[PDB]
RNA sequence: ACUCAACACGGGGAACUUUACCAGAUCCGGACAGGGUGAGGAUUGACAGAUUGAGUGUUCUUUCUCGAUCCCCUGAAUGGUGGUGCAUGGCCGCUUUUGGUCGGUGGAGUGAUUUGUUUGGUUGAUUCCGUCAACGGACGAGAUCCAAGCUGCCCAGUAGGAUUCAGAAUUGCCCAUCCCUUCCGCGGGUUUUACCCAAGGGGGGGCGGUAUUCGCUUGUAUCCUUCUCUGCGGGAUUCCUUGUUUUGCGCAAGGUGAGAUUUUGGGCAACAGCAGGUCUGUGAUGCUCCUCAAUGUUCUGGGCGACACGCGCACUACAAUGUCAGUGAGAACAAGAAAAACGACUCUUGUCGGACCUACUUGAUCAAAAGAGUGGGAAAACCCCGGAAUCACGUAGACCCACUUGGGACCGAGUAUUGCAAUUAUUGGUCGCGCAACGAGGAAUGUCUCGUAGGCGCAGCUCAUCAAACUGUGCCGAUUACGUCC
């Protein structure tokens, strides 16, 4: 492993591959974007970036944790049931992305459902995160 | 492969008479003896209302069992295992295994 | 806090029959108590031990409520 | 591993300073260790203490430590 | 469900850990090896 | 396993209850069982071992047969033995049965209980207690105590030393309760919580 | 059941079952033939027809199948969630969470009674020391036990680390970690001081001689028991302050120390009792009620216990938001505990796998709910045995002082899942209504002093199916007081 948490994985490993991936297309954009991504919304899926805060991160989780997928990988999914029926709030996940995200890894920086690196492209291209921000970073 | 002996019992001082004492017979005498330290001891906890009616202070109990699982290991006895498992007869729920 | 009459009784008897016990050290007096006694409690043996120290520390003044065989000489 | 984020950070500090101390024990004289250690002890963690105050059991017929259900009149 | 040491089916059936001893209460009907110490 | 221990509990329960009812006033203490590998000894603790066996031998094989027909056991996997318990005094349940017999014969409560007390406290017991609640009047539900020697109810340790028996007597007007305790002079933990001794 | 020892209580989250109760039918359980019918009987079983909600074979007709048990009359009987808990056994609650209780011998009194069990001090304590017409005793208390904190010994193949071999991978110079630190010497910029610049010697490694992390690269080598685990043992009411202590019983602060006193948290508990509760826990029961158009009883059907003038009370939960704060995203990270086996198939000279979970992949060339196949486990194996809430976050997110984008409760339409049967049972789901309440809420009143209160989540429990409940584990974690008796 190598990916995530070596550059600050929370907010300084995300925006940089995001820019690069939208600038030249790579990952899935399949219809289903509008549909509920996180439990019991009263709003739309998000204000902007419906399924473009997702894809590399959903590779990252499975990478460093070795073959967490489809039921384990929603482990680092979310759901609080933040609106509820006046009972004690409980955790959930929405399966929608699981299918698409186990498809993903066969292209771009990972190989297979057993081996999750190639040259580990994301790491190498993320070495310029530290050097210079692309967001006007506070710490750079 | 290597044969192991797990002895599962409700009570201590039944299993004790098995492991310590009657493994001496298999210690280097016919096979070699690798002692680890026995597996974690489960509790079976049950909670029972004391009162047989709806008027009390709504009291309850805590009842517990110990489950002693005593594991000691040997290095491949075959046909010798017959001796090993015929040794304890000293309490009920003494059960032994052979791989 | 306050100790029971079992404690004080046993410890008084000990200090009468033994002057092997003579110390203000908890540790020594404990090890000679426990081997000479059958009481089958940690608590009682530690109590009794500390009481025997307390006795001897008071005997440094002179007056005690304890029992000793010293009366022979006095 | 074994508790939430906050308690892990506490545990971190402890194991770090422990490691420094033990290193300077084995490979280096007691003098250097005494210097280091005394200043650790001083500066409010303590170092030595595991802070080993854990938890409460839940009991009866009752929820946590007492606030009961809520009263019947008396 | 239903019970096998009564036929009452009411006054509550334990089926925890595959036993019934609450259609005949376990305080009265002990010697199952359980004890209370805490 | 989890289930082993529970099922052993079940077996003991059923067994113990069957005997303690239908075989009684023999000085029945109880039963004890242990395995000898694909056979179970199942010794039967009685003061009088002759009734257990039978003088026609019918009793012992009846009791084997009942167990077999219930649990699908066969011969050579199941056996029943007798054991001679000396001093009926030191068995709670046994004294309980003899007392029950006195009362069903319509003998005086006082006289009856005094028999038990005499017997027990002769063999060197620390204490005994006979608490007979129930009818003796009407119109009360009167409770009579008889307390002898000394007895402890402190700790959880007491439970091991002191064995207890509760039984019923069934008479005209209805039920009479009976209870017997008896603190043994001999520990079953080999432990005391009082008297620090000094070895001289 | 009804102040407390009623009122999310009767392990009671009940729809058919459970079931007392209601709407109807049935059985023999009325067994026991002692007084009668054997063949062909009042009968056992039965297609059609009828009976009736029930083509149901109870019944009645038809015709068939018949043991003679079923059936006839008495006596006898058994069964019951029926009453009586003021007939009763056992059990539980409370009195009572305090320190209380009883006998022998002796003393005193006509006796009922008293002394022991008592002025003082100390303690949670009838806990102690002292004193006395009491003396010597027994219980409760203490202690013995259970769990927690620190530790020795045991100690390794499902517990987890150490080094090298190993290759993936990185070897960060695109905005900073070749450049420093320490010691020392000399020359400059300073009038002096402070401050600072240059060069060299010695010394230490730093980015590469220390390089990461993989909880599977499960690869290839080597070694160990710090981290783990369970059984059995260590560890103070000692020392000191020379304070307080008239000597005693002891008290306070500080110290050693993992831990300062009933070590800490629980569990058990005397005597006297209550007309407490329980006869719907029982094969624990007195009597007398139900004992056949039985009400008992039914894998019988359906209904009730749950109803709604907007009525009172008890308990619970959700909010009125800026101190998760409201809709979005991403990161790091937890602990007890649950689980499996059907005489059902197959297997043989004496017999194996299906009703538990979780893994993985299709379920997205197009939703959720939800379909199915492969794979392992009887559990320290279940894929890392353990994860997403409280929390963290400036990613330069969105909302922004409003009954809203804060909250849900009503209400309509659709669909799948569960089941012997659903009648919002289903509900982890879509998407309407929200602009329906409610803005910390009169009087009154509850309970806790520490890892507690408060906040938060998970599992077990019950079981066709549902947990705002109950039980247990874990996480975040204070303010005030440490006093008095009003």
UniProtKB/TrEMBL annotation, chain B:
One of its GO terms (molecular function) is structural constituent of ribosome. One of its GO terms (biological process) is translation. It comes from the Eukaryota. The keyword Ribonucleoprotein applies. Keywords: Ribonucleoprotein, Ribosomal protein. Residues 4-98 form the Small ribosomal subunit protein uS10 domain. One of its GO terms (cellular component) is small ribosomal subunit. Belongs to the universal ribosomal protein uS10 family. This is Small ribosomal subunit protein uS10. It comes from Trypanosoma cruzi (strain CL Brener). The chain holds residues 15 to 113 of 117 of the full protein.
Automatic annotation (TrEMBL), chain C:
Belongs to the eukaryotic ribosomal protein eS17 family. This is 40S ribosomal protein S17, putative. The chain holds residues 58 to 131 of 196 of the full protein.
Automatic annotation (TrEMBL), chain D:
Coiled coil: none annotated. It comes from the Eukaryota. Belongs to the universal ribosomal protein uS9 family. This is 40S ribosomal protein S16, putative. The lineage of its organism: Eukaryota, Discoba, Euglenozoa, Kinetoplastea, Metakinetoplastina. The chain holds residues 76 to 149 of 149 of the full protein.
TrEMBL record, chain F:
GO terms for cellular component: cytosolic small ribosomal subunit; nucleus. One of its GO terms (biological process) is translation. One of its GO terms (molecular function) is RNA binding. The keyword Acetylation does not apply. InterPro entries: KH_dom-like_a/b, KH_dom_type_2, KH_sf_prok-type, Ribosomal_S3_C_sf, Ribosomal_uS3, Ribosomal_uS3_C, Ribosomal_uS3_euk/arc. Keywords: Ribonucleoprotein, Ribosomal protein, RNA-binding. Residues 15-86 form the KH type-2 domain. The keyword Cell division does not apply. Belongs to the universal ribosomal protein uS3 family. This is 40S ribosomal protein S3. It comes from Trypanosoma cruzi (strain CL Brener).
């Amino acid at each position: 492993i190598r990916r995530i948490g070596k550059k600050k994985g929370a907010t300084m490993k995300d925006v940089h591959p995001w820019r690069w991936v939208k600038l030249c297309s790579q990952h899935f954009k399949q219809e289903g974007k509008l549909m509920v991504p996180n439990c019991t919304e009263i709003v739309k899926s998000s204000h902007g970036r419906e399924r473009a805060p997702q894809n590399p991160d959903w590779y990252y989780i499975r990478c460093a944790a070795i073959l967490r997928a489809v039921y384990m990988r929603p482990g680092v999914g979310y759901g609080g049931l933040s609106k509820r029926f006046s009972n004690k709030k409980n955790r959930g996940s929405r399966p929608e992305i699981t299918v698409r995200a186990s498809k993903g890894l066969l292209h771009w920086g990972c190989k297979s459902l057993t081996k999750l690196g190639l040259i580990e492209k994301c790491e190498s291209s993320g070495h310029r995160i530290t050097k210079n921000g692309r967001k006007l970073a506070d710490a750079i | 492969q290597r044969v192991l002996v797990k002895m599962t019992s409700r009570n201590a001082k039944a299993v004790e008479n098995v492991m310590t004492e009657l493994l001496l017979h298999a210690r280097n005498e016919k096979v070699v003896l690798r002692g680890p330290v026995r597996l974690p001891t489960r509790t079976l906890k049950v909670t029972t209302r004391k009162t047989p009616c709806g008027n009390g202070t709504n009291t309850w109990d805590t009842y517990e069992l110990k489950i002693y699982k005593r594991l000691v290991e040997l290095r491949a006895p075959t046909e010798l295992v017959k001796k090993i498992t015929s040794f304890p007869i000293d309490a009920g729920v003494d059960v032994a295994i052979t791989i | 806090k306050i100790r029971t009459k079992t404690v004080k009784r046993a410890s008084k008897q000990l200090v009468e029959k033994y002057f092997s016990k003579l110390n203000k050290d908890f540790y020594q007096n404990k090890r000679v108590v426990m081997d000479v006694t059958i009481a089958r409690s940690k608590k009682l043996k530690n109590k009794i031990a500390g009481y025997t120290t307390h006795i001897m520390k008071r005997l440094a003044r002179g007056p005690v409520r304890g029992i000793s065989l010293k009366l022979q000489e006095e | 591993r074994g508790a939430g984020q906050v308690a892990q950070a506490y545990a971190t500090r402890q194991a770090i300073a422990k490691g420094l101390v033990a290193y300077y024990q084995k490979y280096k004289n007691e003098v250097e260790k005494a210097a280091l250690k005394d200043k650790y002890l001083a500066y409010d963690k303590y170092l030595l203490i595991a802070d080993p105050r854990r938890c409460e059991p839940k009991k009866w017929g009752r929820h946590s430590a007492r606030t009961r259900f809520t009263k019947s009149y008396r | 469900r239903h019970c096998v040491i009564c036929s009452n089916q009411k006054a509550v059936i334990r089926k925890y850990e595959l036993n019934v001893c609450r259609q005949c209460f376990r305080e009265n009907a002990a010697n199952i090896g359980f004890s209370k110490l805490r | 396993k989890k289930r082993m221990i529970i099922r052993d509990g079940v077996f003991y329960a059923e067994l113990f209850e069957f005997l303690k009812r239908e075989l009684a006033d023999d000085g029945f203490a109880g039963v004890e069982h242990r395995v000898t590998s694909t056979r179970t000894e199942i010794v039967i603790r009685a003061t009088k071992t002759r009734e257990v066996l039978g003088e026609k031998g019918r009793r012992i094989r009846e009791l084997t047969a009942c167990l077999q027909q219930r649990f699908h056991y066969k011969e050579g996997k199941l056996q029943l033995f007798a054991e001679r318990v000396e001093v009926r005094g030191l068995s709670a349940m046994a004294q309980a049965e003899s007392l029950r017999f006195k009362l069903l014969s319509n003998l005086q409560v006082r006289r009856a209980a005094m028999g038990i007390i005499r017997h027990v406290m002769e063999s060197g017991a620390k204490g005994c207690e006979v608490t007979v609640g129930g009818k003796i009047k009407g119109q009360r539900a009167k409770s009579m105590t008889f307390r002898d020697g000394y007895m402890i109810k402190s700790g959880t340790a007491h439970k091991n030393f002191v064995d207890v028996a509760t039984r019923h007597c069934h008479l005209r007007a209805g039920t009479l309760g009976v209870k017997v305790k008896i603190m043994l002079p001999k520990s079953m933990q080999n432990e005391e919580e009082i008297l620090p001794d000094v070895i001289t």
